[PDB]
């Protein structure tokens, strides 16, 4: 009877057509993540690959996106992609920052010598600023790194503390250096 032939037609037929498309695009080009981006300067990105890893404390955070040259400063500029669930990371974090602000701000002459109106202004800008950060503190470095004594490349993005954060989309300024064997040799360094 058609009762069965129709049920048989739908099963697999209606699975397989979508299956081929979804089981490929999900593997070769279609994705979704709460990404944020940031920019940085470097003096010498020797060998860093365009798809190298970006890490905090050794946990993978994100990926190198694009490596380019500025021909009139002769500096490298590298863009990052960071996954927000591992960095911003929830709502409680904002409250923790606000709490840290209550402990760190008004712990100095900034508020002692300020009128209540000025103290309120400082708290208001604090909220505005913190509302859009991804928790990398302003004392942080960036440098390049590698898998080990042979392998591919990466960026350690360590930290150093304080109630000062890079706003999402901003540039991490205080960065430094590389490692190159050509110079270690010429300087006769161990």
């Amino acid at each position: 009877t058609s009762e069965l032939a129709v049920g048989i037609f739908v099963i697999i037929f209606g699975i397989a057509l979508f299956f081929l498309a979804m089981k490929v695009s999900g593997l070769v080009g279609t994705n979704l993540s709460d990404g944020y981006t940031m920019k940085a300067q470097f003096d010498n990105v020797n060998g860093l690959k365009p798809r190298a890893k970006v890490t905090m404390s050794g946990v993978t955070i994100g990926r190198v996106d694009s490596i380019t040259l500025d021909p009139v400063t002769r500096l490298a500029t590298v863009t990052f992609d960071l996954d927000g669930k591992l960095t911003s990371f929830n709502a409680e974090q904002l409250k923790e920052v606000q709490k840290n602000a209550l402990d760190e701000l008004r712990y100095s002459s900034d508020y002692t010598q300020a009128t209540p109106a000025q103290q309120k202004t400082m708290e208001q800008q604090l909220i505005s600023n913190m509302n859009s950060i991804t928790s990398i503190d302003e004392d942080a470095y960036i440098m390049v790194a590698t898998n080990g004594l042979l392998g591919e490349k990466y960026l350690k993005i360590v930290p150093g503390g304080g109630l000062n954060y890079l706003k999402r989309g901003d540039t991490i300024s205080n960065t430094q250096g590389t490692m190159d064997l050509e110079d270690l040799i010429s300087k006769f360094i161990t």
Partner: peptide, 11 residues
């Protein structure tokens, strides 16, 4: 039309 596939698979 569609039931054709159904019958093919069943057999």
């Amino acid at each position: 039309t569609i039931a054709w596939l159904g019958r093919l698979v069943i057999e």
